[PDB]
Amino acid sequence: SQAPYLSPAVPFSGTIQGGLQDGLQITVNGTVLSSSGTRFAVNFQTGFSGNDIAFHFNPRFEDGGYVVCNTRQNGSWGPEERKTHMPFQKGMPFDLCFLVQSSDFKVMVNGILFVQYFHRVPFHRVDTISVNGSVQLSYISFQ
Ligand SMILES: CC(=O)N[C@@H]1[C@@H](O)[C@H](O[C@@H]2O[C@H](CO)[C@H](O)[C@H](O[C@@H]3O[C@H](CO)[C@@H](O[C@@H]4O[C@H](CO)[C@H](O)[C@H](O[C@@H]5O[C@H](CO)[C@@H](O[C@@H]6O[C@H](CO)[C@H](O)[C@H](O)[C@H]6O)[C@H](O)[C@H]5NC(C)=O)[C@H]4O)[C@H](O)[C@H]3NC(C)=O)[C@H]2O)[C@@H](CO)O[C@H]1O
């Protein structure tokens, strides 16, 4: 059991001890800022560069509110999967939970399953979580 990151500053990048494993649950607890921009992202990536992001989870308070899910490989973005629902709210606290499964990530927001994202690259290669944009973080916890 890895220790939680408590009140990490954004932008944040942090090691996932042992990498993503089938059954690992990562919790991101925080607050979407009220008036500090219109997007944030949680990135599950290989190392610290961010050129290789297995899963980019990117809520955008733009064009009615939607969430982009995508993968970056060797610096190139793939085809976006957009969920045209926004489960977050500017100025409001959230609990965001990611469950790593064999074929996909399951993402719950505030106790409710929000989206799944099927793996495009091997998940075992992911050892870093990064968070950027319009968000303040209280904690990131593991397992
Ligand atoms: C309808 C349609 O088709 N529309 C599309 C749009 O959807 C599309 O928009 C793009 O869509 C994609 C998803 O598909 C994505 O949302 C794009 O957004 C960009 O995404 C990236 C990743 O989240 C952002 O770039 C990253 O930003 C952060 C800060 O916010 C950093 O700057 C990242 O760079 C890394 O920074 C690290 C931390 O500082 C650094 O690591 C550090 O290095 C230090 C030493 O130098 C030290 O060691 C330290 O300890 C260490 O942590 C990394 O080295 C550094 N990496 C690199 C490569 O230098 C950066 O990667 C980006 O901010 C974000 N942009 C926006 C606007 O949100 C989104 O643009 C568009 C465009 O494709 O096309 C339309 O058609």
Using an 8 Å Cβ cutoff, are 94 and 82 in contact? Answer: no
Instruction: Quickly tell me which residue has 């500053």 as its tokens.
Output: 9
Answer whether CATH 2.60.120.200 is correct for domain 1-143. yes
Please give the resolution of this entry in Å, rounded to 1 decimal.
Answer: 1.8
Q: Residues with beta carbon inside 6 Å of ligand 1?
A: 11, 13, 39, 41, 43, 48-51, 56, 58, 68, 70, 77, 80, 132
**Residue 114 phi, psi dihedral angles, 5° rounding:** -105, -50
Using an 8 Å Cβ cutoff, are 104 and 22 in contact? Answer: no
Using an 8 Å Cβ cutoff, are 125 and 54 in contact? Answer: yes
Dihedral angle computed from the Cα positions of residues 133, 138, 142 and 143, in that order, rounded to the nearest 10 degrees: -120
Beta bridge partners of 128: 15, 45
| Coil vs helix vs strand at 70 | strand
Q: What is the 3-state secondary structure (H, E, C) of 1-69?
A: CCCCEECCCCCEEEECCCCCCCCCEEEEEEEECCCCCCEEEEEEECCCCCCCEEEEEEEECCCCCEEEE
| Coil vs helix vs strand at 142 | strand
Distance CA 94, CA 97 (A): 10
Sign of CA dihedral 29, 121, 133, 39: negative
Nearest CA to ligand 1 atom 53: 49
Region for 128 from its dihedrals, namely left if φ exceeds 0, alpha if ψ lies in -120 to 50, beta otherwise: beta
Beta bridge partners of 26: 98, 142
Distance CA 66, CA 11 (A): 21
Contacts of 110 (CB under 8 A, 6+ apart): 87, 94, 95
**Residue 97 phi, psi dihedral angles, 5° rounding:** -120, 135
What single letter denotes the amino acid at residue 57? F
